[PDB]
Short mmCIF file of N, CA and C in Angstrom, two decimals:
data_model
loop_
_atom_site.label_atom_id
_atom_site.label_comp_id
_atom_site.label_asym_id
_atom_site.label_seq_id
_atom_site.Cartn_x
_atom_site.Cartn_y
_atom_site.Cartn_z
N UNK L 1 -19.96 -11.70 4.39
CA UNK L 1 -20.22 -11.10 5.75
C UNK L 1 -19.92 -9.60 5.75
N UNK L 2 -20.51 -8.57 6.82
CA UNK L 2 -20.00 -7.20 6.88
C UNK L 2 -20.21 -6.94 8.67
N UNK L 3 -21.32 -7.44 9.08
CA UNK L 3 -21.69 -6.92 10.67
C UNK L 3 -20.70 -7.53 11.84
N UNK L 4 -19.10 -8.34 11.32
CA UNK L 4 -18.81 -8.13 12.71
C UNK L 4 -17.32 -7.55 12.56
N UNK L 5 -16.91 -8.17 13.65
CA UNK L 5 -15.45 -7.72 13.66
C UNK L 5 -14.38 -8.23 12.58
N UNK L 6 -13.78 -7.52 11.66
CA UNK L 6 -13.32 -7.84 10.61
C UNK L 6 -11.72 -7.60 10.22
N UNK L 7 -10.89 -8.27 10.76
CA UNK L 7 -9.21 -7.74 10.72
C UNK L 7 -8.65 -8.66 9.57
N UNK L 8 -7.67 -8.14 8.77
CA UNK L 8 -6.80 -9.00 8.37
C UNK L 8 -7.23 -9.41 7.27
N UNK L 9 -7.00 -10.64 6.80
CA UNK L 9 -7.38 -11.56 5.18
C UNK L 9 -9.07 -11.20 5.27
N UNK L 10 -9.71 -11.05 5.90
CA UNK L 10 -11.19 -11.29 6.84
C UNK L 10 -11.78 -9.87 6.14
N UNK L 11 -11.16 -8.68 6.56
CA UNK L 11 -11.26 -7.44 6.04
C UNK L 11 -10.98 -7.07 4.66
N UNK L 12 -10.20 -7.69 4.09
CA UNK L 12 -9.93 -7.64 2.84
C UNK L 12 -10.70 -8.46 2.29
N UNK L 13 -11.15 -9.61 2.39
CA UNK L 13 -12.12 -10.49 2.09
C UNK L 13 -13.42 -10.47 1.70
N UNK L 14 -13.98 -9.36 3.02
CA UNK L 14 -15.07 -8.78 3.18
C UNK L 14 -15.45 -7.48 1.52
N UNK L 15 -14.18 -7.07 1.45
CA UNK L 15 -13.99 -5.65 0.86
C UNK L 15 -14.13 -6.12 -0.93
N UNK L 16 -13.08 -7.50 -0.89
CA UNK L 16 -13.01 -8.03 -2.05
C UNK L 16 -14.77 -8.26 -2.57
N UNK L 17 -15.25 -9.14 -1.87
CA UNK L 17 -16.59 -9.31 -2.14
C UNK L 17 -17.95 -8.20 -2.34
N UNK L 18 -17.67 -7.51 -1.56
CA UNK L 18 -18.45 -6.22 -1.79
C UNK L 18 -18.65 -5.20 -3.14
N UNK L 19 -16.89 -4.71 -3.00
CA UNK L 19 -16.47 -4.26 -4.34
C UNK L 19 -16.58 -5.18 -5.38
N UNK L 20 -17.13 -4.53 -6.47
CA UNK L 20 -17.06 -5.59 -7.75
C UNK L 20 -15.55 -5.84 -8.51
N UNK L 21 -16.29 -5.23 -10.04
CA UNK L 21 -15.38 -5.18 -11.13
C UNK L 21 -14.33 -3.66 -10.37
N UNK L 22 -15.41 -3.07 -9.38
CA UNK L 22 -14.63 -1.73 -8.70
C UNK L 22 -13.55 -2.12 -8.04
N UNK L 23 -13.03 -3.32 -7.30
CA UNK L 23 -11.87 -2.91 -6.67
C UNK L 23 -12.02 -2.28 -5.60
N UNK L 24 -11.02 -2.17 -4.77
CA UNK L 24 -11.14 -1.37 -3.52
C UNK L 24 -9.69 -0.84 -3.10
N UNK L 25 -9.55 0.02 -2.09
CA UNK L 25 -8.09 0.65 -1.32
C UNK L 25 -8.22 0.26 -0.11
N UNK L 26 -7.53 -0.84 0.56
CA UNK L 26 -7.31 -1.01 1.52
C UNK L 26 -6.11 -0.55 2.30
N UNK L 27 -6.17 0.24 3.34
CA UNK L 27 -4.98 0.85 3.86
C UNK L 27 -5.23 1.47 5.30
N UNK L 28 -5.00 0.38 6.05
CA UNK L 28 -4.66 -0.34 7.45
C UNK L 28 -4.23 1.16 8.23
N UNK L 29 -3.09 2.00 7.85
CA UNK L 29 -3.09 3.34 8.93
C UNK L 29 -3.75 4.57 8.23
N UNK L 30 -4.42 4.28 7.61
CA UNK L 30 -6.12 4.86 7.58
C UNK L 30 -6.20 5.43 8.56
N UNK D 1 -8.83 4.95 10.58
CA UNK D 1 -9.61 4.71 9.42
C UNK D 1 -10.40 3.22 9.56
N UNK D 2 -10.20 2.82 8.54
CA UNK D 2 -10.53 1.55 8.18
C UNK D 2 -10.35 -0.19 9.33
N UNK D 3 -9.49 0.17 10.33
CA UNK D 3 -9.20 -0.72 10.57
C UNK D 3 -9.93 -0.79 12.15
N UNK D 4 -10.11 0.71 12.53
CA UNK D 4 -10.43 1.36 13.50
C UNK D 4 -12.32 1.01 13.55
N UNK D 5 -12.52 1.56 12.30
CA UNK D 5 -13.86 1.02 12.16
C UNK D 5 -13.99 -0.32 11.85
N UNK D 6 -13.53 -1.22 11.67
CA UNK D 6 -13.77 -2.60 11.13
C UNK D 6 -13.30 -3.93 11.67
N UNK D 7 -12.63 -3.25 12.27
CA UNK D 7 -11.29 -4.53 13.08
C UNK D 7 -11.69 -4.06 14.52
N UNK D 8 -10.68 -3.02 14.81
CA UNK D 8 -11.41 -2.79 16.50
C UNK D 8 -12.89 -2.69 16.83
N UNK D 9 -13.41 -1.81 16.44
CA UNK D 9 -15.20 -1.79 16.14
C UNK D 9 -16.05 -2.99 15.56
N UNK D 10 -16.53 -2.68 15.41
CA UNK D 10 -17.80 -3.79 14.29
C UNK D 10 -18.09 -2.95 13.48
N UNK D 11 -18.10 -3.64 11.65
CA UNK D 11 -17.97 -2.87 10.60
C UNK D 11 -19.35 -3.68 10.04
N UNK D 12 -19.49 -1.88 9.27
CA UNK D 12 -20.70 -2.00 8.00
C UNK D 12 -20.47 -2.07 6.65
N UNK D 13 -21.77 -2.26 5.90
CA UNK D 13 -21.53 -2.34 4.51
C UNK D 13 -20.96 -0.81 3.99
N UNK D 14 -21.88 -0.02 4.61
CA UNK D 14 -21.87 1.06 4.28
C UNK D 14 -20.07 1.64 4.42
N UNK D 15 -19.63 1.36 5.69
CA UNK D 15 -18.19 2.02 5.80
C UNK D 15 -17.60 0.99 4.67
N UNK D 16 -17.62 -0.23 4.92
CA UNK D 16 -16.74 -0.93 3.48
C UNK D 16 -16.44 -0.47 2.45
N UNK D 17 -18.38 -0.05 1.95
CA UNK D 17 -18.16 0.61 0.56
C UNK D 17 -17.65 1.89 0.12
N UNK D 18 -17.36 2.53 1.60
CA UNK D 18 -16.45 4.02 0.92
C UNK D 18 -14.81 3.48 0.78
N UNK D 19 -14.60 1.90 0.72
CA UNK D 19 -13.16 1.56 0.11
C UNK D 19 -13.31 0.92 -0.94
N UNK D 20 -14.25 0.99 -1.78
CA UNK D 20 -13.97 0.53 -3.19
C UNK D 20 -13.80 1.88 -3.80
N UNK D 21 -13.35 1.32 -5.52
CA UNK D 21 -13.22 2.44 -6.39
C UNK D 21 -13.98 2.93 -7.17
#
């Protein structure tokens, strides 16, 4: 998923799947 | 950031993908 509202395990989830072998930076006070 | 666009807002692929590496 990417088009809705996305907080939490959900957002990271989203991010995990997107990003590949890349990985991602998740950081919430962004 | 990120949470602002994605959590409070409704998020895209596009903003997602400026958090990978």
């Amino acid at each position: 998923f990417v088009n809705q509202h996305l907080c939490g395990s959900h957002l990271v989830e989203a991010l995990y799947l997107v990003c590949g072998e890349r990985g991602f930076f998740y950081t919430p006070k962004a | 950031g990120i949470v602002e666009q994605c959590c409070t807002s409704i998020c895209s692929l596009y903003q997602l993908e400026n958090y990978c590496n």
